Design a protein around this ligand. Structure first.
Ligand SMILES: CC(=O)N[C@@H](C)C(=O)N[C@@H](Cc1ccccc1)[C@H](O)CN(Cc1cccs1)S(=O)(=O)c1cc(F)c(F)cc1F
Lengths: 99, 99
């Protein structure tokens, strides 16, 4: 689709079999989801935002369907204020900015 | 133009007399600029994201040019690590997400 920006670009995603709402976030390097359970191995990591740094759990090679488009990649889980889909997966689904 | 997301979507902006690089950020409701001593009235605000909150100064009806496209709106000035062009200005320059 073409998505305008008068409203937050929120979409439904499917991950670990569960539906969630997430924000398409071109200003995020990485995909960060609010606290949740995901299967398999993870590694501790840190990421920075506007307010400083947080600790996250890094899950690699995770399938997520974003607005009907398949991606498989890194998902960080931690204290983000909202679920965000970052550039690592936005690239996978062929998302660009246009004006 | 079309901007892919392999790298951060940094573009040149102009505000006041200054040229800066700024992120075209669909995850940002509002535009946040690195500390600069702009003229005119402002009001204090707190804005939050990953890591917590920072204190900013809200300036209204500030002209800004983004990739040669004229815009005018609210800018939040404070100790952000990156200049962020948020949806309040992205809509004005006709920016969409496409996939
Ligand atoms: C390094 C990185 O990619 N960090 C991501 C997770 C990130 O926090 N991205 C921010 C933009 C940013 C990038 C690098 C450094 C600092 C910030 C989001 O795209 C926009 N953010 C919003 C977020 C949504 C989900 C997590 S942070 S916000 O916190 O920066 C933000 C909050 C406001 F209240 C505001 F008015 C404007 C904003 F841009």
């Amino acid at each position: 689709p073409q998505i305008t920006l008068w409203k937050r670009p929120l979409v439904t995603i499917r991950i670990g079999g569960q539906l969630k709402e997430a924000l398409l976030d071109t200003g995020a390097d990485d995909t960060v989801l609010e606290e949740m359970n995901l299967p398999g191995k993870w590694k501790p990591k840190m990421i920075g935002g506007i307010g400083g740094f947080i600790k996250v759990r890094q899950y690699d090679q995770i399938p997520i369907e974003i607005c009907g488009h398949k991606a498989i990649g890194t998902v960080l889980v931690g204290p983000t204020p909202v679920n965000i889909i970052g550039r690592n997966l936005l690239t996978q689904i062929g998302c660009t900015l246009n004006f």
